[PDB]
Amino acid sequence: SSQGLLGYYFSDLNFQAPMVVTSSTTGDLSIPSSELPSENQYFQSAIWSGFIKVSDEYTFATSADNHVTMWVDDQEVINNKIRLEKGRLYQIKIQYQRENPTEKGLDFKLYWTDSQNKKEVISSDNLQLPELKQKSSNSRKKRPDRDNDGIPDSLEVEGYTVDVKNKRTFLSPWISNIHEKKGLTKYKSSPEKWSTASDPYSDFEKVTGRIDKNVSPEARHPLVAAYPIVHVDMENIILSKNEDSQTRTISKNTSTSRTHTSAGFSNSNSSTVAIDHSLSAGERTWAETMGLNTADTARLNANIRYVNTGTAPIYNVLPTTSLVLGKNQTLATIKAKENQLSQILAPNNYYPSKNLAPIALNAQDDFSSTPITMNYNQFLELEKTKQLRLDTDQVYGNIATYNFENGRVRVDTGSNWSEVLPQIQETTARIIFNGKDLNLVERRIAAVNPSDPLETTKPDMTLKEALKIAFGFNEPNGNLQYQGKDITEFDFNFDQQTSQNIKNQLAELNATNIYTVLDKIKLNAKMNILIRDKRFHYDRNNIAVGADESVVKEAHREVINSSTEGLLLNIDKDIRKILSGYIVEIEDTEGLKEVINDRYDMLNISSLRQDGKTFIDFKKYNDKLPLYISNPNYKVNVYAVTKENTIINPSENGDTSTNGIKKILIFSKKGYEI
Binding site for Ca ion (CB under 5 A): 145, 147, 149, 151, 189, 191, 203
3-state SS record for 637-674: EEEEEEHHHCCCCCCCCCCCCCCCCCCEEEEEEEHHHC
Q: Which helix (H) or strand (E) holds 235?
A: strand 230-241
DSSP characters for 476-492? SSSS-EETTEEGGGEEE
What is the rounded CA–CA span in Å between residue 467 and residue 441? 12
Q: Which helix (H) or strand (E) holds 127?
A: strand 127-128
Please state the closest distance from residue 202 (CB atom) to Ca ion, in A: 7
Question: 199 vs 203, which CB is nearer to Ca ion?
Answer: 203
Asked whether residue 193 is marked as a ligand-binding residue, the answer is yes
Helix (H, G, I), strand (E, B) or coil at 122: coil
What percent of the residues of the chain are helix, what percent strand, and what percent coil, each to the nearest 5? 15, 35, 50
Question: 223 vs 239, which CB is nearer to Ca ion?
Answer: 223
Q: How far apart are the first and last CA of the chain?
A: 68
Please state the closest distance from residue 150 (CB atom) to Ca ion, in A: 6
Please state the closest distance from residue 191 (CB atom) to Ca ion, in A: 5
Please state the closest distance from residue 3 (CB atom) to Ca ion, in A: 20
What is the rounded CA–CA span in Å between residue 441 and residue 305? 17
Q: Which residues of 651-666 are buried (b: 16+ CB within 10 A; e: fewer)?
A: eeeeeeebeebebbeb
Question: 132 vs 334, which CB is nearer to Ca ion?
Answer: 132
Q: Which helix (H) or strand (E) holds 157?
A: helix 153-158
Question: 147 vs 601, which CB is nearer to Ca ion?
Answer: 147
Question: 110 vs 207, which CB is nearer to Ca ion?
Answer: 207
How far from chain centre, in Å, is Cα 634?
52
Helix (H, G, I), strand (E, B) or coil at 252: strand
Please state the closest distance from residue 242 (CB atom) to Ca ion, in A: 58
How far, CA to CA in Å, does 277 sit from each of 282, 596, 602, 656? 14, 19, 9, 12
Question: 208 vs 392, which CB is nearer to Ca ion?
Answer: 208
Please state the closest distance from residue 222 (CB atom) to Ca ion, in A: 7
Please state the closest distance from residue 237 (CB atom) to Ca ion, in A: 48
Asked whether residue 598 is marked as a ligand-binding residue, the answer is no
Question: 151 vs 226, which CB is nearer to Ca ion?
Answer: 151
Asked whether residue 460 is marked as a ligand-binding residue, the answer is no
Question: 201 vs 494, which CB is nearer to Ca ion?
Answer: 201
Provide the H-helix boundaries in 452-526: 463-471, 496-508
Beta strands 528-533; 269-275: pairing state:
unpaired
How far, CA to CA in Å, does 302 sit from each of 254, 280, 358, 374? 9, 17, 9, 14
Please state the closest distance from residue 23 (CB atom) to Ca ion, in A: 15
Question: 150 vs 546, which CB is nearer to Ca ion?
Answer: 150
Asked whether residue 142 is marked as a ligand-binding residue, the answer is no
Please state the closest distance from residue 447 (CB atom) to Ca ion, in A: 15
DSSP characters for 521-541? PBPBTT-EEEEEETTEEE-TT
Asked whether residue 151 is marked as a ligand-binding residue, the answer is yes
Q: Which long-range contacts (CB under 8 A, 24 or more apart) does 616-622 make?
A: 616/566, 616/567, 616/568, 616/569, 616/582, 616/584, 617/565, 617/566, 618/564, 618/565, 618/566, 618/567, 618/584, 619/565, 619/566, 621/596, 621/597, 622/584, 622/596, 622/597
Question: 203 vs 276, which CB is nearer to Ca ion?
Answer: 203
Question: 391 vs 465, which CB is nearer to Ca ion?
Answer: 465
**Alpha-carbon dihedral 479, 482, 487, 489, rounded to 10 degrees:** 130
Please state the closest distance from residue 29 (CB atom) to Ca ion, in A: 21
Please state the closest distance from residue 322 (CB atom) to Ca ion, in A: 38
Quick check: 493 and 478 in contact, CB under 8 A?
Answer: no
Beta strands 89-97; 45-53: pairing state:
antiparallel
Asked whether residue 156 is marked as a ligand-binding residue, the answer is yes
Residue list, annotated binding site for Ca(2+): 145, 147, 149, 151, 156, 190, 193, 203
Residues contributing to the annotated binding site: 145, 147, 149, 151, 156, 190, 193, 203
